Amino acid sequence: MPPYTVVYFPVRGRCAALRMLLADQGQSWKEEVVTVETWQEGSLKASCLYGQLPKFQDGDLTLYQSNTILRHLGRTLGLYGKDQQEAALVDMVNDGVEDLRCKYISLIYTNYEAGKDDYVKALPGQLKPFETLLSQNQGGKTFIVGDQISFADYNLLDLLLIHEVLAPGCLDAFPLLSAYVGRLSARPKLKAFLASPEYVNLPINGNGKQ
Amino acid sequence: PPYTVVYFPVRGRCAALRMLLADQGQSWKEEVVTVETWQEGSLKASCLYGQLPKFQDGDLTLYQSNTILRHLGRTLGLYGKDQQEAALVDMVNDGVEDLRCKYISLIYTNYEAGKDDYVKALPGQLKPFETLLSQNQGGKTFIVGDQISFADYNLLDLLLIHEVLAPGCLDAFPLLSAYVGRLSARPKLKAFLASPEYVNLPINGNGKQ
Numbered sequence: 001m002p003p004y005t006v007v008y009f010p011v012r013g014r015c016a017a018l019r020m021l022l023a024d025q026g027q028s029w030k031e032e033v034v035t036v037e038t039w040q041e042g043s044l045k046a047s048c049l050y051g052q053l054p055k056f057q058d059g060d061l062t063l064y065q066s067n068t069i070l071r072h073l074g075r076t077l078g079l080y081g082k083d084q085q086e087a088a089l090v091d092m093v094n095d096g097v098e099d100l101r102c103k104y105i106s107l108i109y110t111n112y113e114a115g116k117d118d119y120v121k122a123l124p125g126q127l128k129p130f131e132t133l134l135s136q137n138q139g140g141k142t143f144i145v146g147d148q149i150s151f152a153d154y155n156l157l158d159l160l161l162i163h164e165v166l167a168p169g170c171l172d173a174f175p176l177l178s179a180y181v182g183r184l185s186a187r188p189k190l191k192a193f194l195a196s197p198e199y200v201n202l203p204i205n206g207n208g209k210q
Numbered sequence: 211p212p213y214t215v216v217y218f219p220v221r222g223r224c225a226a227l228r229m230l231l232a233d234q235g236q237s238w239k240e241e242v243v244t245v246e247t248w249q250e251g252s253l254k255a256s257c258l259y260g261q262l263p264k265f266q267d268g269d270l271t272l273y274q275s276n277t278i279l280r281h282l283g284r285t286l287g288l289y290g291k292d293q294q295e296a297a298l299v300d301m302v303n304d305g306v307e308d309l310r311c312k313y314i315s316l317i318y319t320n321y322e323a324g325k326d327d328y329v330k331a332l333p334g335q336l337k338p339f340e341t342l343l344s345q346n347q348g349g350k351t352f353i354v355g356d357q358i359s360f361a362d363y364n365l366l367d368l369l370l371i372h373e374v375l376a377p378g379c380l381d382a383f384p385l386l387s388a389y390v391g392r393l394s395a396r397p398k399l400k401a402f403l404a405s406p407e408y409v410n411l412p413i414n415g416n417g418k419q
């Protein structure tokens with residue numbers, strides 16, 4: 001059996017990026033799906049460290065927290081910079097991605113109707129830092145940090161993909177980010193995964209909003 | 211090194227990394243940014259995500275409090291003994307960060323109306339860290355493994371500020387209580403925590419705690 005198991009709801013959500021990472025890196029894993037019904041029964045939830053999913057298994061190592069899973073795979077698969085300095089820049093990018101993801105999640109689940117207009121208006125100011133990072137790294141022609149892909153690339157890519165669904169054309173103001181999405185999305189193993197039923201037939205979020 | 215931390219005159223998101231630096235016998239410079247200086251706008255516009263802290267390690271400039279913690283963790287060897295422990299360290303820190311975010315939201319956006327529900331929910335939010343301790347050397351060492359990690363400093367801060375918010379919140383948790391006492395007694399950290407540099411800063415920037 002595969003050494004990796006992803007335990008999650010039937011959504012892309014906070015597992016989209018780590019799945020893209022595993023697929024693009026040619027790693028095999030198992031998906032264990034948790035229905036809302038099973039979740040509401042409460043026993044799985046009570047057994048989760050912080051009462052939430054995803055849960056991730058790497059052999060007998062059990063992890064929670066999506067960014068913990070990303071960093072773990074980043075370490076073990078060599079997607080965490082070429083040295084200690086790059087590692088810090090990778091973290092700086094991912095923490096930035098996480099900050100915006102939290103705001104996105106808040107909009108989706110708690111304030112979509114009333115909050116969307118304001119959110120989209122504020123969105124360019126939130127995306128600009130990643131354009132800036134790209135512009136300062138080899139003219140934005142490679143990756144978000146250095147000249148090799150990192151776990152932060154997969155997370156940023158997901159963030160950008162879901163925001164294009166939320167606010168179509170939001171990357172028209174950001175040529176480097178736009179080219180970056182096209183470029184990474186064209187990586188053969190990743191392109192195949194993104195096109196597959198395994199990815200396409202899951203909703204982005206759990207409440208039907210996107 | 212050398213280290214410079216750039217921040218408002220509060221403990222806030224720099225409390226943990228300061229405890230780390232002090233406990234680890236590191237030297238650093240504080241560049242205090244006043245609210246008036248911040249409102250001028252130029253510094254803010256120059257920050258990657260428009261926020262402090264900003265951190266300098268020689269010619270390396272960092273933003274994001276947890277990036278700074280992880281950087282110090284990796285460079286000073288406060289990140290567990292191997293990859294499996296490093297993952298556990300991240301799991302703790304991400305958990306600490308999740309509760310810190312909830313704390314910050316309470317303090318700055320909903321203190322008066324929201325404190326009652328927050329404090330009622332607090333035991334269930336703290337229990338995971340007690341459980342983690344219980345599963346590591348009976349809670350007698352650190353939150354992960356047998357050596358201190360950056361997650362310890364972050365968790366310690368989280369616990370200290372919650373004792374201020376909700377006195378007695380650790381009384382039902384013997385391992386966390388003993389852990390706070392034990393880490394706080396570490397000589398360099400004890401001296402730092404007792405110093406005006408720590409004591410005479412407010413925890414947050416809006417006078418609430």
Ligand SMILES: N[C@@H](CCC(=O)N[C@@H](CS)C(=O)NCC(=O)O)C(=O)O
Binds near residue numbers: 045054067304308
């Ligand atoms: N900080 C956590 C947050 C995880 C989280 O919010 N999980 C949600 C779904 S994405 C969940 O389990 N909701 C059910 C519940 O909280 O009871 C992470 O990064 O994984």
Ligand SMILES: N[C@@H](CCC(=O)N[C@@H](CS)C(=O)NCC(=O)O)C(=O)O
Binds near residue numbers: 099222260261263276
């Ligand atoms: N995720 C960031 C959040 C940083 C943050 O929230 N900084 C606040 C003070 S703690 C700030 O700069 N406020 C002023 C502003 O946003 O303009 C981190 O961990 O450092």
Ligand SMILES: [Ca+2]
Binds near residue numbers: 239241
């Ligand atoms: Ca100074």
Ligand SMILES: [Ca+2]
Binds near residue numbers: 286287288289357358
């Ligand atoms: Ca050590």
Ligand SMILES: [Pt+2]
Binds near residue numbers: 102105
């Ligand atoms: Pt969040």
Ligand SMILES: [Pt+2]
Binds near residue numbers: 310311312
């Ligand atoms: Pt937050």
Ligand SMILES: [Pt+2]
Binds near residue numbers: 102311
């Ligand atoms: Pt948050």
